[PDB]
Each structure stands twice: as structure tokens, then as C-alpha cells.
Design an enzyme around this catalytic site. Structure first.
Site, PDB file in Angstrom:
ATOM      1  N   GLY A  13       0.825  -1.203   0.000  1.00  0.00           N
ATOM      2  CA  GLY A  13       0.000   0.000   0.000  1.00  0.00           C
ATOM      3  C   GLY A  13       0.857   1.249   0.000  1.00  0.00           C
ATOM      4  O   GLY A  13       2.013   1.216   0.425  1.00  0.00           O
ATOM      5  N   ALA A  16       0.089   8.557   2.935  1.00  0.00           N
ATOM      6  CA  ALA A  16       0.369   9.990   2.851  1.00  0.00           C
ATOM      7  C   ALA A  16       1.860  10.165   2.993  1.00  0.00           C
ATOM      8  O   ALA A  16       2.528  10.584   2.061  1.00  0.00           O
ATOM      9  CB  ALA A  16      -0.378  10.760   3.933  1.00  0.00           C
ATOM     10  N   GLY A  18       4.662   7.728   3.296  1.00  0.00           N
ATOM     11  CA  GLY A  18       5.181   6.376   3.238  1.00  0.00           C
ATOM     12  C   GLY A  18       4.598   5.381   2.246  1.00  0.00           C
ATOM     13  O   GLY A  18       3.950   5.713   1.240  1.00  0.00           O
ATOM     14  N   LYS A  35       6.462  -0.712   7.190  1.00  0.00           N
ATOM     15  CA  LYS A  35       6.025   0.612   6.797  1.00  0.00           C
ATOM     16  C   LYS A  35       7.303   1.430   6.718  1.00  0.00           C
ATOM     17  O   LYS A  35       8.082   1.437   7.665  1.00  0.00           O
ATOM     18  CB  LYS A  35       5.114   1.249   7.846  1.00  0.00           C
ATOM     19  CG  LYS A  35       4.671   2.659   7.479  1.00  0.00           C
ATOM     20  CD  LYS A  35       4.094   3.377   8.699  1.00  0.00           C
ATOM     21  CE  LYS A  35       3.172   4.519   8.294  1.00  0.00           C
ATOM     22  NZ  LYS A  35       2.275   4.894   9.428  1.00  0.00           N
ATOM     23  N   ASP A 121      -9.133   6.917  13.174  1.00  0.00           N
ATOM     24  CA  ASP A 121      -9.424   6.754  11.754  1.00  0.00           C
ATOM     25  C   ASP A 121      -9.882   5.383  11.345  1.00  0.00           C
ATOM     26  O   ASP A 121      -9.303   4.705  10.451  1.00  0.00           O
ATOM     27  CB  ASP A 121      -8.205   7.186  10.946  1.00  0.00           C
ATOM     28  CG  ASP A 121      -8.543   7.595   9.522  1.00  0.00           C
ATOM     29  OD1 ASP A 121      -9.696   7.964   9.138  1.00  0.00           O
ATOM     30  OD2 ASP A 121      -7.576   7.555   8.763  1.00  0.00           O
TER      31      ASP A 121
HETATM   32  C1  LIG Z   1      -1.431  -1.866   3.383  1.00  0.00           C
HETATM   33  N1  LIG Z   1      -0.955  -2.222   4.706  1.00  0.00           N
HETATM   34  C2  LIG Z   1      -0.759  -3.475   5.132  1.00  0.00           C
HETATM   35  N2  LIG Z   1      -0.970  -4.480   4.267  1.00  0.00           N
HETATM   36  C3  LIG Z   1      -0.775  -5.752   4.707  1.00  0.00           C
HETATM   37  N3  LIG Z   1      -1.006  -6.798   3.897  1.00  0.00           N
HETATM   38  C4  LIG Z   1      -1.585  -6.820   2.646  1.00  0.00           C
HETATM   39  C5  LIG Z   1      -2.373  -5.779   2.182  1.00  0.00           C
HETATM   40  C6  LIG Z   1      -2.944  -5.846   0.931  1.00  0.00           C
HETATM   41  C7  LIG Z   1      -2.750  -6.958   0.123  1.00  0.00           C
HETATM   42  C8  LIG Z   1      -3.381  -7.053  -1.226  1.00  0.00           C
HETATM   43  O1  LIG Z   1      -4.510  -7.514  -1.322  1.00  0.00           O
HETATM   44  N4  LIG Z   1      -2.643  -6.728  -2.305  1.00  0.00           N
HETATM   45  C9  LIG Z   1      -3.182  -6.763  -3.660  1.00  0.00           C
HETATM   46  C10 LIG Z   1      -2.902  -5.459  -4.349  1.00  0.00           C
HETATM   47  O2  LIG Z   1      -1.512  -5.160  -4.362  1.00  0.00           O
HETATM   48  C11 LIG Z   1      -1.018  -5.072  -3.030  1.00  0.00           C
HETATM   49  C12 LIG Z   1      -1.227  -6.355  -2.275  1.00  0.00           C
HETATM   50  C13 LIG Z   1      -1.969  -8.010   0.575  1.00  0.00           C
HETATM   51  C14 LIG Z   1      -1.368  -7.947   1.820  1.00  0.00           C
HETATM   52  O3  LIG Z   1      -0.574  -8.926   2.359  1.00  0.00           O
HETATM   53  C15 LIG Z   1      -0.082  -9.959   1.497  1.00  0.00           C
HETATM   54  N5  LIG Z   1      -0.373  -6.143   5.920  1.00  0.00           N
HETATM   55  C16 LIG Z   1      -0.164  -5.136   6.764  1.00  0.00           C
HETATM   56  N6  LIG Z   1       0.188  -5.226   8.059  1.00  0.00           N
HETATM   57  C17 LIG Z   1       0.269  -3.963   8.568  1.00  0.00           C
HETATM   58  C18 LIG Z   1      -0.021  -3.079   7.585  1.00  0.00           C
HETATM   59 CL1  LIG Z   1      -0.106  -1.368   7.837  1.00  0.00          CL
HETATM   60  C19 LIG Z   1      -0.334  -3.768   6.456  1.00  0.00           C
END
Ligand SMILES: CNc1nc(Nc2ccc(C(=O)N3CCOCC3)cc2OC)nc2[nH]cc(Cl)c12
Ligand SMILES: [Cl-]
Ligand code: NA
Length: 261
Positions: A13, A16, A18, A35, A121
Site C-alpha cells: 500500500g 500519505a 510512506g 512501513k 481513523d
Molecule cells: C497496506 N498495509 C498493510 N498491508 C498488509 N497486507 C496486505 C495488504 C494488501 C494486500 C493485497 O490484497 N494486495 C493486492 C494489491 O496489491 C497489493 C497487495 C496483501 C497484503 O498482504 C499480502 N499487511 C499489513 N500489516 C500492517 C499493515 Cl499497515 C499492512
């Protein structure tokens, strides 16, 4: 790109300030989230709050490393992605899945409030899912202390996301923390059950909000919601924060306790 023993392998992800990366350890293959922040009184607070967190419905903090202008915050990975991506637009999701997520969101929020932390949030982008679809409240960059040495402090800073924010936050110079987080949980519940947000913001000039206060529940999104969860939403999305339902009383609600598929 890498950091000490980890490779940064995929952008999970953007933020803002990072980016969150999938970090995979070269030796062990463990996978975590990291992050990455460019350039710190703030991130000092954040790390401090992050080290407090120990609950199954809150993202775990593993540690951090500073390398020049870059801080790396290592955290539990939520390999299921976000709640946001489980909500079908204009539809929502099945009621039993919405209820389960709502239970897990309450368990997290009670935990936070119990340690005197408000998240500020709460929304589906910040509600992540592990491999078993267990909900984890993520992102403590706006989080703050509202209770310390058993003494509550009122908040005054405006922050959050307009469609999730409680109306007192727009009208009062100072307000209590807990009912603001409760309110955002009700808008998350509406999103889950209707795949649509009810209003742009809860202000006197927003017609959709006036409509709700006038109880026009033959309009969308309310008309898509069964009467039992809707009766709960009627107790959460209450304009005056002292009259708003508290979490102990949400836990007594008829829908909250209804057995579902
Ligand atoms: C976005 N933030 C986070 N994201 C995640 N995992 C994941 C978030 C999204 C996806 C996801 O569906 N994708 C498809 C689209 O292209 C990006 C990955 C996969 C994740 O994992 C494998 N784990 C976190 N732990 C703490 C934070 Cl903060 C955090
Ligand atoms: Cl939505
Ligand atoms: Na949309």
C-alpha cells in the site's frame, strides 16, 4: 531493495507519508509488513503506541530500524488484505460475515480503549485481514492517548476521514474520544451491509445526513439493511455523543447477539 536481513518484495500500500512493503526474510522466509517513512516527533509517538499493542484484533509491532532519513516499522502481516476489498459496491457482503467482522472490530476497539488509546481513523482501509480472515485494526499514525493515570483527556484536534467522522468532531471545540470511534464503527457497519456510505459528512448542510436525522429509512443505504442491524445503527449514529450507545450496550443489542449463518 532490502533492510538488514529482509528483502522488500512488493508494495502492499501507499500512504500519505510512506509505503507499506511485503518484507521476506532471506534465510527464514518469514514474511512481515514494513512501513517505510521518509524523514519524527510524530513517528516517536506512533512507535511508542505501537509497542503497547498486544491483542489478536490489533496489528502487532515487531520493532523498528532507522537508516538515514528512513524509518522501517516492522509489523504483523495481514495476508488477507483489507476489509475494503471484501465489500461489493452497492451490495455489501453477507450479513453473517458482516456480523463476525463487527464482533472482531468491537473486540479490538474495546482493547484500545481499555489501554487508553483512541485510533481516530477507523474505516475499511485500516481494517486488515489475516489468512483466516481475522480482522486486525491497523495504522496508528493518528492514534493518541485519551486516558492516562485513570484521568480522561478530551480531544480537540480534527482528524480522521470525513465520511467516517462523528458530527461532534465538526461542531465542538473539545470532545470525548470513545464515542468518536464508536461512530466510525457504525459507518463501517453500514458500508459492510449496504456497500455504500450514507453521507459525505455528518454536517447540517449535507442533505443525506438530514435525511437520516429525519428518519427517512426508505432511502438508500438504509433500505438495503435488515431491520435488526438497522435498529443498532439507529443507536450508534446518534448526533449527541452523550446519548450515543456505548460499547457495553452494543454488546447487549439484539442484532449483535443474533445467531447467523
Ligand atoms: C497496506 N498495509 C498493510 N498491508 C498488509 N497486507 C496486505 C495488504 C494488501 C494486500 C493485497 O490484497 N494486495 C493486492 C494489491 O496489491 C497489493 C497487495 C496483501 C497484503 O498482504 C499480502 N499487511 C499489513 N500489516 C500492517 C499493515 Cl499497515 C499492512
Ligand atoms: Cl464502502
Ligand atoms: Na466506490
Amino acid at each position: 531493495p532490502f533492510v538488514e536481513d529482509w528483502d522488500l518484495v512488493q508494495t502492499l500500500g501507499e500512504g500519505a507519508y510512506g509505503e507499506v512493503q511485503l518484507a521476506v526474510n532471506r534465510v527464514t522466509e518469514e514474511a512481515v509488513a514494513v512501513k517505510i517513512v521518509d524523514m519524527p516527533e510524530n513517528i516517536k509517538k506512533e512507535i511508542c503506541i505501537l509497542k503497547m499493542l498486544n491483542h489478536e484484533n490489533v496489528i502487532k509491532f515487531y520493532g523498528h530500524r532507522r537508516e538515514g532519513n528512513i524509518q522501517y516499522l516492522f509489523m504483523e502481516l495481514a495476508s488477507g488484505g483489507s476489509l475494503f476489498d471484501r465489500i461489493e459496491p452497492d451490495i455489501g457482503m453477507p450479513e453473517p460475515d458482516a456480523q463476525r467482522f463487527f464482533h472482531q472490530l468491537m473486540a479490538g476497539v474495546v482493547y484500545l480503549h481499555g489501554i487508553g488509546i483512541t485510533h481516530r481513523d477507523i474505516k475499511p482501509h485500516n481494517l486488515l485481514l489475516d489468512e483466516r480472515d481475522n480482522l486486525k485494526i491497523a495504522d496508528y499514525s493518528l492514534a493518541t492517548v485519551f486516558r492516562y493515570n485513570n484521568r480522561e483527556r478530551l480531544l480537540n484536534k480534527m482528524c480522521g476521514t470525513l465520511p467516517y467522522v462523528a458530527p461532534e468532531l465538526l461542531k465542538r471545540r473539545e470532545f470525548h474520544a470513545e464515542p468518536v470511534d464508536v461512530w466510525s464503527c457504525g459507518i463501517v457497519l453500514t458500508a459492510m451491509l449496504a456497500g455504500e456510505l450514507p453521507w459525505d459528512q455528518p454536517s447540517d448542510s449535507c442533505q443525506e445526513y438530514s435525511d437520516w436525522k429525519e428518519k427517512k429509512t426508505y432511502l438508500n443505504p438504509w433500505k438495503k439493511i435488515d431491520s435488526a442491524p438497522l435498529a443498532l445503527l439507529h443507536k450508534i449514529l446518534v448526533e449527541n455523543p452523550s446519548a450515543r450507545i456505548t460499547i457495553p450496550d452494543i454488546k447487549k443489542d439484539r442484532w449483535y447477539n443474533k445467531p447467523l449463518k
